[PDB]
Amino acid sequence: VPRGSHMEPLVTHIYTADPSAHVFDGKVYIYPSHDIDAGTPENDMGDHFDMRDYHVLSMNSIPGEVTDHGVALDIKDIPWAGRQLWAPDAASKDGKYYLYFPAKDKEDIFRIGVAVSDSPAGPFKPESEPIKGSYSIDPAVFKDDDGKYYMYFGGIWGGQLQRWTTGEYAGHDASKTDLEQDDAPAIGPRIALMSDDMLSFAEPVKEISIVDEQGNPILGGDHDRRFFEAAWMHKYNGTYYLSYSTGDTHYIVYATGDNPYGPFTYRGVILNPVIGWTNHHSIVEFNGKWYLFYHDSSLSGGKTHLRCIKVTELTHNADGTIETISPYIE
């Protein structure tokens, strides 16, 4: 039956989170986390998010019937992975499809790997090692209009980005949160141009600057605006939109720039806080309409680790501002 008309859950047979939406073969393909009730301890390092596989979803229209294509990748078949298959993303190039995914390696360090298929629905064959020079979580692979592909990535707290300031892991006894310098600039998300074969980075990883309207860096203590996780890139009017989750303040916010690397100037809120602690999204154009894919914990009765994905229309103004969405108003 058709789904996605009144911000209802898009699927109810499994718990779903972290929706990354793409238009491939004229259909919407969604690459979400598959939440499970693992019963692991709950904490600020995210051990309660103990996902083990990915199902790819697709829609021919919005609203529309949502197809669950089954397990596209299982952690048991990723040779380098130890635990925790967190939010994935996909890209298409030269008739191949690439699934990018964060997982903890056998030293319990988040890395980002790639898996390859001939179909947007998978299943995907993982590379035996993660991407060299990758770390942390939440990849978003963005195809720019010039044909260049960039991976945006990173997440603080349990995503470990705060432990990577020197390009080597600071250790399991390092900061559990951020730089612990609230009057210093906040940690920024990461970006790298992808190699032609889509399996590696084509440059040393860069860090993105996010500034306020006066041009000053967003500070570590500014939790309403500083980067937490879930970077996403989209373009409108030739402007680059970096949107992201603020984590402990529960917003999706956005910042605008004139090129993939930024700097990006904080503009405002995309999505106000939802039911459940986490907030994670993507923004996609389909048949000339823009959509915000997001999640909440409504289906599970408010359990933070058992989520369901939803969709709503997103409105850009011609000046490039975006109207803030509040999830439970209409």
Active site residues: 18, 229
| Three-state DSSP state, 249 | helix
Q: Dmax of the chain from CA atoms?
A: 52
Minimum gap (Å) between residue 122 Cβ and Na ion:
18
| C-alpha torsion sign, points 119, 120, 125, 131 | positive
Residue 67 makes contact with Na ion by CB under 5 A: no
Minimum gap (Å) between residue 168 Cβ and Na ion:
25
Minimum gap (Å) between residue 247 Cβ and Na ion:
14
Q: How many helices (H) and strands (E) does the chain have?
A: 0, 21
Out of 78, 140, 192, 299, point to the residue binding Na ion (CB under 5 A). 140
Q: What residues numbered 287-316 form the site for Na ion, per CB under 5 A? A: none
Q: Which is nearer to Na ion, 72 or 140 (CB)?
A: 140
Q: Distance between CA 316 and CA 60 in Å, rounded?
A: 23
According to the annotation, is 183 in a ligand binding site? Answer: no
Query: Position 65: which residue type?
Result: E
According to the annotation, is 87 in a ligand binding site? Answer: yes
According to the annotation, is 144 in a ligand binding site? Answer: no
Residue 79 makes contact with Na ion by CB under 5 A: no
Residue 156 makes contact with Na ion by CB under 5 A: no
Q: Which is nearer to Na ion, 5 or 321 (CB)?
A: 321
The site string for Na ion over 236-275 (x = CB under 5 A, - otherwise) reads --------------------------------x-------
User: How far is C-alpha 10 from the chain's CA centre?
Assistant: 18
Q: Distance between CA 314 and CA 328 in Å, rounded?
A: 15
Residue 278 CB coordination number (10 Å): 24
According to the annotation, is 257 in a ligand binding site? Answer: no
The single-letter DSSP state of residue 242 is E
Q: Which is nearer to Na ion, 162 or 243 (CB)?
A: 243
| Torsion from C-alpha of 264, 140, 4, 58, nearest 10 degrees | 150
Minimum gap (Å) between residue 326 Cβ and Na ion:
10
Please identify, among the stretches 26-34, 104-112, 121-129, 223-231, the one whose residues bind Na ion according to the rule CB under 5 A: 223-231
Contact indicator for 46, 258 with CB cutoff of 8 Å: no
Binding annotation for Ca(2+): 280
Question: Which spans of this chain sit near Na ion (rule: CB under 5 A)?
Answer: 140, 230, 232, 268, 324
